[PDB]
Amino acid sequence: MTSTFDRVATIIAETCDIPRETITPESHAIDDLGIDSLDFLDIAFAIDKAFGIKLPLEKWTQEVNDGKATTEQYFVLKNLAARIDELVAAKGALEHHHHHH
């Protein structure tokens, strides 16, 4: 029993050495865990290859710093785990389509 969050949290411990105990689902990877966006690239590429998906990290980070999206929307570990899972669902091409197509 290990969720998408728990996989990510293991990968955070592997990459940037952040204690699993001090990693909550409602934690912000950058603000709360104190991980830089570059260190988060190493985490996100390790996630990327693990789940066999593709995170548009550059897109997510440009939206965040353009004020299109709030930081927490992508960088809170439950929202992040939901984004990854959403792209694992997109990896399987769904059957009810992604948005509408």
Closest CA to 8 of 73, 64, 91, 16: 16
Domain count for the chain, please give it: 1
Angle at 71 between CA 2 and CA 56, to 5 degrees: 65
Closest CA to 50 of 74, 15, 18, 26: 15
Range of the domain at 97: 1-101
CATH number at residue 43: 1.10.1200.10
Contact 9, 84 (CB under 8 A): no
Contact 3, 55 (CB under 8 A): no
What's the CA gap between 95 and 65, in Å, rounded?
33
What's the CA gap between 12 and 46, in Å, rounded?
9
Both tokens of residue 90?
């997109």
Closest CA to 74 of 91, 60, 84, 53: 60
Report DSSP state, residue 96: S
- Helix, strand and coil in the chain, % to nearest 5: 55, 0, 40
